Design a binder for this molecule. Structure first.
Ligand code: EQH
Ligand code: CL
Ligand code: CL
Length: 243
C-alpha cells in the first residue's frame, strides 16, 4: 500500500520515495485514472502487467503497482536511477561545451544494444529522454515535436529501424546534436532521405565513427544487427552492466 512508502520529494508526476521496511530508495510514477473510461483502464491494466514481465539489467525494473481508489491514483513503483536521464546529460554537455568520454559512449552503445536485443526477443521509444543512468555506470532503457530519430522506412513503409534510432542517439551523444536537423518535418524528411551528416567530432576514434555511420545507412539491410554490433572490437566486458 501507499502507506508502506514515504515520499522524499518530487523529481518530475514522478517521486523519489523510501520504503519503510528496509529504507530502500525507489521512485514511483503517479497516474490519476479518475477520468478514464472502462476501456482505457483495461488497457492500463494490460500494460502494467506487461511491465512486470520484462526483467533485464539494462531495462528500468518495475517492482510494484499500488492502487489508491480514494484519490483514484495508480502508483507504479520502480528502480531509482540516480544519474537521471540521458537527455539532461546531453544538455549539460551542450551548455558547458564539454564532450562526453568515448568510454561513456561505448557503455551506452553496449548496454542499449543489449536492451534492444531483449526487446526484440520478447516479440520502447529509443530517445535520450527514455534512457537512464544509475549509480554504478549502468545504462537503462525506460518506457508536436520534430521526429529527429525517424528512419527512412518509417517515413513510408523492422528491427533495423531500431538500429537507425540507436545510431541517432549515439550520434547525438557524441556531437551533442542530432545527425539530421531542420525546422519542419518535411525539411527533416528531406535531409534523412539524402542520408548525409557531419562526422562525429575528431576526439572520437575512427572505429566509433564507423559503426555509428553504419547504423545510419539508408538501406536497412546494410545496418549492423544487434549481434554484429556486439562483435565489434570496441566493445569490452567493462562496458557492460555491473551490479
Ligand atoms: N526510475 C527513475 N529514476 C530516476 C529518474 C530521474 S529522471 C531525471 C532526474 C532523475 C533523478 C536523480 C534525480 N527517472 C526515473 C523514471 C521516470 C519515468 C519512467 C517511465 O516512463 O517508466 C522511466 C524511469
Ligand atoms: Cl563536428
Ligand atoms: Cl546492472
Amino acid at each position: 500500500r501507499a502507506e508502506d512508502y514515504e515520499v522524499l520529494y518530487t523529481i518530475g508526476r514522478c517521486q523519489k520515495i523510501r520504503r519503510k521496511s528496509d529504507g530502500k530508495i525507489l521512485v514511483w510514477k503517479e497516474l490519476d485514472y479518475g477520468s478514464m473510461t472502462e476501456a482505457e483502464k483495461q488497457m492500463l491494466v494490460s500494460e502494467v502487467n506487461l511491465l512486470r514481465e520484462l526483467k533485464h539489467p539494462n531495462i528500468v525494473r518495475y517492482y510494484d503497482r499500488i492502487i489508491d481508489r480514494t484519490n483514484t491514483t495508480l502508483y507504479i513503483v520502480m528502480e531509482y536511477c540516480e544519474g537521471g536521464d540521458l537527455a539532461s546529460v546531453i544538455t549539460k554537455g551542450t551548455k558547458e561545451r564539454q564532450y562526453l568520454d568515448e568510454e561513456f559512449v561505448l557503455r551506452v552503445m553496449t548496454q542499449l544494444t543489449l536492451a534492444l536485443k531483449e526487446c526484440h526477443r520478447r516479440s520502447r521509444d529509443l530517445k535520450p529522454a527514455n534512457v537512464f543512468l544509475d549509480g554504478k555506470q549502468n545504462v537503462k532503457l525506460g518506457d508536436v515535436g520534430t521526429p529527429y530519430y525517424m528512419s527512412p522506412e518509417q517515413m513510408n513503409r523492422n528491427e533495423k529501424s531500431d538500429i537507425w534510432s540507436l545510431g541517432c542517439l549515439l550520434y547525438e551523444l557524441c556531437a551533442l546534436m542530432p545527425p539530421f536537423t531542420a525546422f519542419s518535418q518535411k525539411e527533416l524528411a528531406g535531409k534523412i532521405r539524402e542520408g548525409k551528416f557531419r562526422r562525429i567530432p575528431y576526439r572520437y576514434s575512427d572505429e566509433l565513427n564507423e559503426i555509428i555511420t553504419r547504423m545510419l545507412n539508408l538501406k536497412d539491410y546494410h545496418r549492423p544487427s544487434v549481434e554484429e554490433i556486439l562483435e565489434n572490437p570496441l566493445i569490452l566486458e567493462h562496458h557492460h552492466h555491473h551490479h
